[PDB]
Amino acid sequence: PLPWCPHLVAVCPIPAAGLDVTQPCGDCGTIQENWVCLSCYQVYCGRYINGHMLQHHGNSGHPLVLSYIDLSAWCYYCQAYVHHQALLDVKNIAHQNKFG
């Protein structure tokens, strides 16, 4: 996993409502394998379910998404996981909500 990527600048402030790691996919409502967009904080399912976060990436261009299964962050442009101090606040909020 990368220690930086050129899309970290697109990570936006966490909503004051916080994160809900049990939030269903905004398109198909599935509770399985969802991700949260780190630009707009919409929640959509992963590639192995109905691929709605990949569709969101396509229709918005938003780069970075956070897994509600394992709190990894994937950048769709870099095609890699990313670890950076800039992602700690959001991973921590998600971790607190998930575990707790």
Ligand X SMILES: O=C(O)CCn1nc(-c2cccnc2)ccc1=O
Contact range with Zn ion by CB under 5 A, out of 14-22, 25-33, 66-74, 91-99? 25-33
Q: Nearest-CA neighbor of 69 among 40, 49, 39?
A: 49
* Contact predicate 10/62, CB 8 Å: yes
Three-class secondary structure of residue 58 per DSSP:
helix
Work out how close the CB of 50 gets to ligand X at its nearest, in angstroms, rounded to a whole number: 10
92 CB neighbour count, 10 Å cutoff: 12
47 binds ligand X (CB under 6 A): yes
- Choosing from 8, 19, 65, 75, the residue that interacts with ligand X (CB under 6 A) is 65
Three-class secondary structure of residue 37 per DSSP:
strand
- Choosing from 2, 12, 14, 54, the residue that interacts with ligand X (CB under 6 A) is 54
| Site residues (vs ligand X, CB under 6 A) | 35, 46-47, 53-54, 65, 74, 76
